[PDB]
């Protein structure tokens, strides 16, 4: 199928508390597998998936160093951007980075990204073409010029196509299990009483896995896209996820209303009523 | 394996 290896990086300066906090978190397809954190007593790349304890010393050594290397590089970047935006050494600031690749059935690179944000907003990003940047502001325009002279995009294209794709292929062989696995949503509707001869019908999806799911309500074949409340998918904590979606309906008329469950581990979509 | 970052 389609597959991704994505890295989420954070750097938070914290004046009067010493050096910034640094974090590299890695994901294969929504599955966290590695984490490195600069506050930990043992600041080192660590597994976070059974199938990662798979890897030998020489590899965890390697990454920890690269990450120590990356940490120092952002420490300067927090300072560089202070410089760019004319900001004092008094405020906490955040650098965020999304980094990685996606490959298709044939294991060929579909999309590659290097995405930066400062203080919770787009700073600079590598365009799909993997040759050009879009810059959010006059500040980012400096990095753009800089990285244009240094050939950053040339360098990053090579990584995303060569190295990323290759590391991704490994990790998937490292754990086929737990990763390809699917838990279907167990669904039901719940009746809840309300003022003014009305009912709230709540459609539940529980213990499913991968997070992605769709719950819709319909009245007589038609989706009630307004009218309908809907919490954000939440982790159960056990590896699975939960979600509900509800609607309001007059006592007696419950049966005119169907709930629908769409989840990539379901044969046909599910259909339910009270 | 994460890339290594070029300074801004």
């Amino acid at each position: 199928g389609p597959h991704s290896l994505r890295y989420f990086v954070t750097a938070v300066s914290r004046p009067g508390l010493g050096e910034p906090r640094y974090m590299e978190v890695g994901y294969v397809d929504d599955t966290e597998f590695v984490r490195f954190d600069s506050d930990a007593e043992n600041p080192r790349y660590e597994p976070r998936a059974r199938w990662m304890e798979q890897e030998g010393p020489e590899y965890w050594e390697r990454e920890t160093q690269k990450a120590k290397g990356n940490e120092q590089s952002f420490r300067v970047d927090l300072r560089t951007l202070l410089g760019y935006y004319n900001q004092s050494k008094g405020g906490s600031h955040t650098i965020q980075v999304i980094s990685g690749c996606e490959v298709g059935s044939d294991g060929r690179l579909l999309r590659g990204y290097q995405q930066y944000a400062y203080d919770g907003c787009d700073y600079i990003a590598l365009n799909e073409d993997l040759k050009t940047w879009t810059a959010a502001d006059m500040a980012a325009l400096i990095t753009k010029h800089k990285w244009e002279q240094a050939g950053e995009a040339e360098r990053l294209r090579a990584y995303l196509e060569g190295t990323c794709v290759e590391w991704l292929r490994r990790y998937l062989k490292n754990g086929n299990a737990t990763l390809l696995r699917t838990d279907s949503p167990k669904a039901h509707v719940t009746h809840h009483s309300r003022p003014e001869d009305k009912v709230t019908l709540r459609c539940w999806a529980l213990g499913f896995y991968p997070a992605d799911i769709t719950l819709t309500w319909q009245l007589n074949g038609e989706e009630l896209i307004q009218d309908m409340e809907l919490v954000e998918t939440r982790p159960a904590g056990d590896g699975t996820f939960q979600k509900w979606a509800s609607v309001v309906v007059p006592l007696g008329k419950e049966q005119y209303y169907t709930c629908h469950v769409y989840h990539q581990g379901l044969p046909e979509p599910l259909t339910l009523r009270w | 394996s994460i890339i290594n970052f070029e300074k801004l």
Binding site: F8, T10, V12, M23, V25, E32, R35, D37, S92, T94, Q96, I98, A117, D119, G120, C121, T190, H192, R202, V231, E232, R234, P235, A236, G237, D238, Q242, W244 | -
Partner: protein, 99 residues
């Protein structure tokens, strides 16, 4: 800059009063990453709630999960209290078994 946290407080398993269980506080969509999350029983802080690691989404906002063990009853409240720079006052969301 500055985004208000969203809060969901829910049990891991179907809640039967008397049956021991797990209570979650899922605090999302917020920014600056600095946050303080407490879990309250009746009004009282639950000693050392467990914190998942912080992460962020595609869209840049931060996501975090607090959880602790609890035994739901008919006759006593559970709540989550978030303190965060985006908010004037701490926000407290009460656990609601239907939700």
């Amino acid at each position: 800059i500055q985004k208000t946290p969203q809060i969901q407080v829910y049990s891991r398993h179907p809640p039967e009063n008397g049956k021991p269980n797990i209570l979650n506080c899922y605090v999302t969509q917020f920014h600056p990453p600095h946050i303080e999350i407490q879990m309250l029983k009746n009004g009282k802080k639950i000693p050392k709630v467990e914190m998942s690691d912080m992460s962020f989404s595609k869209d840049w906002s931060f996501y975090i999960l607090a959880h602790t063990e609890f035994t739901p009853t008919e006759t006593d409240t559970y709540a989550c209290r978030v303190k965060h720079a985006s908010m004037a006052e701490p926000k407290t969301v009460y656990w609601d078994r239907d939700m």
